[PDB]
Amino acid sequence: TAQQQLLEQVRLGEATHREDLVQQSLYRLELIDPNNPDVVAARFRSGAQKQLDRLSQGPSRDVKLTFAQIAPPPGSMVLRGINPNGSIEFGMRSDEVVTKAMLNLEYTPSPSLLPVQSQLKVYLNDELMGVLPVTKEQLGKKTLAQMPINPLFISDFNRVRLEFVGHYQDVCEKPASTTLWLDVGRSSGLDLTYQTLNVKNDLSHFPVPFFDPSDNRTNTLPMVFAGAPDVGLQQASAIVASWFGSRSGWRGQNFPVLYNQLPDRNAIVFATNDKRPDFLRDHPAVKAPVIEMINHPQNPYVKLLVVFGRDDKDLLQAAKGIAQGNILFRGESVVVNEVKPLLPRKPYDAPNWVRTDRPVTFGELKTYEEQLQSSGLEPAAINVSLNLPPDLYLMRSTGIDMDINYRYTMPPVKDSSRMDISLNNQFLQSFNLSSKQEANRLLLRQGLLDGKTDVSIPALKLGATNQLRFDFEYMNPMPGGSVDNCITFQPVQNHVVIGDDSTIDFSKYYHFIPMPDLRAFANAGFPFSRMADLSQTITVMPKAPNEAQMETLLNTVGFIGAQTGFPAINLTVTDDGSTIQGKDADIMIIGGIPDKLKDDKQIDLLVQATESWVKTPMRQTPFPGIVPDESDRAAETRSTLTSSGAMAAVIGFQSPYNDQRSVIALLADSPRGYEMLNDAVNDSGKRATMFGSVAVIRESGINSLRVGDVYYVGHLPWF
């Protein structure tokens, strides 16, 4: 049984005195079956009296994880004497257990390294589990190696570390030399199998059965309705999708929808008191909004979440309660009472976005403790990734001012070691590390130096996302002395630390951005992401939406709430285009166009049935400047073509009701085109290839362009 392996892991962890493994195993055995006396006794070992009180009272998946997918970008790894460690990380869900795991390697040792002495080691969260010595027959040839992985040592989050220690000379070998290396091919990878378990129908660990942060793959939980949902039900589903997208984050969001059809995976079921789904028939009527989880009628391995309410208002209340907290999930059939309204949100208050009104310390930008430090012969570059609003604008002034406090080891040379600051892989400035020792006396034979630096960056172009990089480049002397009698310096590991007191400020920027620019929409959700809860957005959805339109709306709202750090609890989904007249908000149109906005002549592309037309700009440049050129973006020709092919596009134009407000519409003509539009929307890689004002999505790919009038949104004072 799986619980037997869980208890074996439990006793293994206590034998190794590792609290992380045992705690995860307990969480798992309690998830699968918390009723047996064994789990309550094991929890007693891990207050203590309560455990004694209650004590007295499947399908499997085979996956391939090659180095080309879960390694640094190039995939291939080169291990040297300065960077001999290489890590590969993967995660296991809390509802699945790994039975068999195998590691396959394909490496080529350098021809010059000494045999036997040079060996390659593997570490699965430490726990040295084998060494691979280098023989004479494999000194300079490609080798195939296979080594099993013990399943009992695998936890929720774990990595495998490849340590390469090698030598090429007995005496006077040069460190950091290129003669020693060990290239690891990208074809190498792991080989493990996961097995699902029939977890208990308990809502206490919400939403682990439906979404667990341990899984690093895309979260694709579907949704099921009764068919042709009403306006309020669409709003509730959009709110739930936004909350789930915010919770998932960068994993990827995809919410397929079904109409009165059972799914084949964990899904959310929306069922009012009336028009109940066919499989939910004979469920007793409810008087209050209630949330419960029920097993799939066919197999118990699929867990379904059912949201029940008297009417669409109760469903909206339940969705708003789910988006917020204080629900206190426990057992099943948890009811949601009146939910307090959310407090008003200041613009640009997204939790993910870095604060702009006040200086931001490096401590809050740090995600894990070991991010702001490095060690080794050549310390690794410290990377600090910060998400920024996409409308930051600089108007002839000093840009990002940042104070840096750092600690570094004393360099061997006086005035050679430098610290390099790079933004978006662009060199910014260099600072020389001080030293108090001459090189001539280095052949003769304890503190840590401190440093303070003030840095100002022009930063004309920032973008939706960016990262920093601090490179500490030392000079390491080679062996010297006389030729007949040489002396080699023993390598010493040097540590570089960036203090948390370092602050970065963006208070000298302005919220100005040319429009229409859907690249910011693709990367940050602008302008709907200006309000974290989407309190200034109206969604125009077609009457009686089909599956494709519901899926497109769900995916768009999920990605918008994923780029933003907060769910959209105040989104307003409408059914007709007449109500948006005389309103001050950003209108997002899904699958179609209102007749009043379709003949305003600001539209640069309109796909209607088999006929579509586009306004070609005058001249398109691959790399535009900061200031848009109106002459270049002026329309030149309008060509209309008709064909049976499937196509979709996303366009943006100024709202005809307000100068500041903007309208972005997603349009499709055929179900295939809807499929391609969904795929482009939910895919992060494809969504980053769109810019300008019109972005067509054909089978070849996405070919965007910029055309039309330019309207500026924001506040810009005198100059």
Numbering used by the authors: 26 to 71, 80 to 90, 1068 to 1455, 1460 to 1733
Q: Mind quoting what the paper says about this structure?
A:
The minimal components of the E. coli cellulose synthase complex include the catalytically active BcsA enzyme, a hexameric semicircle of the periplasmic BcsB protein, and the outer membrane (OM)-integrated BcsC subunit containing periplasmic tetratricopeptide repeats (TPR). Additional subunits include BcsG, a membrane-anchored periplasmic pEtN transferase associated with BcsA, and BcsZ, a periplasmic cellulase of unknown biological function.
As also observed for the wild type Bcs complex, cryo-EM analysis identified a fully assembled Bcs complex together with (likely dissociated) partial subcomplexes containing three to five BcsB protomers. TPR#1 mediates all interactions with BcsB and is best resolved. TPR#2 is rotated by about 45° relative to TPR#1 and extends away from BcsB. It interacts extensively with one side of CBD-1’s jelly roll, as well as the region connecting the jelly roll with FD-1 (residues 208–220), Fig. 3b. The helix’s C-terminal end fits into a hydrophobic pocket formed by the CBD-1/FD-1 connection.
